[PDB]
């Protein structure tokens, strides 16, 4: 494939990840309760790497599940790649959306150095496909305004993908609001994932954070939706709320 030469980039930006990175631990309906659960979560108020498209994307390690998020207005950010070597020697998870059908593959891929789709044509993101073991395709379809926050994790052979899509009116940085991520897909792949990369279709930016094994308190309201949460071991106040099993401390 082609190689990029002209780059208008900067050193990787950093921001604060807070009030985000929480997902439903299971598929049970419970309402007006406080439930404690221990799992890999995004620690609140941690440091999250902020990337921009030049005005390309590096490959990042996949440590025990990754939180991804990005704000969008023209569907630039069109997929991800996961694997260890990413050169067709091993199976590599591929997720793509070429404006028609979301495609999921585990084929052995010779990935292009510089993914790009479409401006309005030229699907050029890989150059090999052999010994494949999975394929999924959906049905046809056609400031930043839509925030999409995903969690990608790999636990005992299942690649679990949680997601949340919301409307927004904000361009500068991540919002200060709270939103829980529903479970969307669980794929049995059986793949050893260690490194990953994103996909652009060539204003654009995204944020990547890393999960840690933490205990969290989750608040289900009268409609069974997560409205708030407390990190455990974030700080003495949160630890007090965590041991007391309450969001209010006297």
């Amino acid at each position: 494939c082609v190689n990029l030469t002209t780059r208008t980039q900067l050193p990787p930006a950093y921001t604060n990840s807070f009030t985000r990175g929480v997902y439903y631990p299971d598929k049970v309906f419970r309402s007006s309760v406080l439930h404690s659960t221990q799992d890999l979560f995004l620690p609140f108020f941690s440091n999250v790497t902020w990337f921009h498209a030049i005005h390309d994307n590096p490959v990042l390690p996949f440590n025990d599940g990754v939180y991804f998020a990005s704000t969008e207005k023209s569907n630039i950010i069109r997929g991800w790649i996961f694997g260890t070597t990413l050169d067709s020697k091993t199976q590599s998870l591929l997720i793509v959306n070429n404006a028609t059908n979301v495609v999921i593959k585990v084929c052995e891929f010779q990935f292009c150095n510089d993914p790009f789709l479409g401006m309005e044509s030229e699907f050029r993101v890989y150059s090999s496909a052999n010994n494949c073991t999975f394929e999924y395709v959906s049905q046809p379809f056609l400031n930043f305004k839509n925030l999409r926050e995903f969690v990608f994790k790999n636990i005992d052979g299942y690649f679990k993908i949680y997601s949340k899509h919301t409307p927004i009116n904000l361009v500068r940085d991540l919002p200060q609001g709270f939103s829980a991520l529903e479970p969307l897909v669980d794929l049995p792949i059986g793949i050893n994932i260690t490194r990953f990369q994103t996909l652009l279709a060539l204003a654009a930016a995204y944020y990547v954070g890393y999960l840690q094994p933490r205990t969290f308190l989750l608040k289900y309201n009268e409609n069974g939706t997560i409205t708030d949460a407390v990190d455990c071991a974030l700080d003495p106040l949160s630890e007090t709320k965590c041991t007391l099993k309450s969001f209010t401390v006297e």
């Binding site: 299971d26 049970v28 020697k89 005992d156 052979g157 299942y158 792949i189 050893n192 069974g224």
Partner: protein
């Protein structure tokens, strides 16, 4: 003489009610048990199964399993259950190595080619195929990994073929001394020893009563009786109680609702998508006021 808060024996349920999804499709048991080709162990096949009724009586009529070991679900209770997801991990192995297909076991198969979670729930089914897969002169279409740099994870499929550096000699990924080809083959002959005969194995992995059920056992459904304490069964979740109408905004992926006590509070009927709260039959204490015996028996 006095008052006594007596135990609650007055009411006992009389009948049973069975409710299941309304699926008439027969499950493709044949395509996995009756298959021309099984996957090799290093590249074991994983088949999603869905939209199924599971009778396992065709296998009774024709097949004969050498081993049927179920973890987490003893088989006799298998008829009256429904499953959230079902994955059939199908492959072939050597006869002795059938022992290795189990949680907590180790071996070449357990370590390099296939692995189960220690918390696995589901059934391992194995039967010999020495008269079908094997052939005179050997069968080299079934391979397995013999060396790996480290141990496997559960349900991890490593189809890599690159050279393994057994020694400290870096042989550039090409064959050489102290570094060999990880994949090896069995020589299956119909006259070979029992421990060397090929065995077809299928592992049905699922997880119970935590999500909507689309596959289920063969029990037929019944009509529902409200405002009466009955022995109910919804998608394999059994119980006893009074079923009453309710309003609950269940999410599409949510099948059961639970109260503070994490007991099932309400169920979404699989056939008619309405939510019914369950309440215990013997609600309400009963206290007996009486004069002491030796005087009267009125109470």
């Amino acid at each position: 003489k006095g008052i006594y808060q007596t135990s609650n024996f007055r009411v006992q349920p009389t009948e049973s009610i069975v409710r299941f999804p309304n699926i008439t499709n027969l499950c493709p048991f044949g395509e996995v048990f009756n298959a021309t080709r099984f996957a090799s162990v290093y590249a074991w096949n994983r088949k999603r199964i869905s939209n199924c009724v599971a009778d396992y009586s065709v296998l009774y009529n024709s097949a004969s399993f050498s081993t049927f070991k179920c973890y987490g679900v003893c088989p006799t209770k298998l008829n009256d259950l429904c499953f959230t997801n079902v994955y059939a991990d199908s492959f072939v192995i050597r006869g002795d190595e059938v022992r290795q297909i189990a949680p907590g076991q180790t071996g070449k198969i357990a370590d390099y080619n296939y692995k189960l979670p220690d918390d696995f729930t589901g059934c391992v089914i194995a039967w010999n195929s020495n008269n079908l897969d094997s052939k005179v002169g050997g069968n080299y279409n079934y391979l397995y990994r013999l060396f790996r740099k480290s141990n496997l994870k559960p349900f991890e499929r490593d189809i890599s073929t690159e050279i393994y550096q057994a020694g400290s000699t870096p042989c550039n990924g090409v064959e050489g001394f102290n570094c060999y080809f990880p994949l090896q083959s069995y020589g299956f002959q119909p006259t070979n020893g029992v421990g060397y005969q090929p065995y077809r194995v299928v592992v049905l992995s699922f997880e119970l009563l935590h999500a909507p059920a689309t596959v289920c056992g063969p029990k037929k459904s019944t009509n529902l009786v409200k405002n009466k304490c009955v022995n109910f069964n919804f998608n394999g979740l059994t119980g006893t109680g009074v079923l009453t109408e309710s309003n609950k905004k269940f999410l599409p992926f949510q099948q059961f609702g639970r109260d503070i006590a994490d007991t099932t509070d309400a169920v979404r009927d699989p056939q008619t998508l309405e939510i019914l709260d369950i309440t215990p039959c013997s609600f309400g204490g009963v206290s007996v006021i009486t004069p002491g015996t030796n005087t009267s028996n009125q109470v």
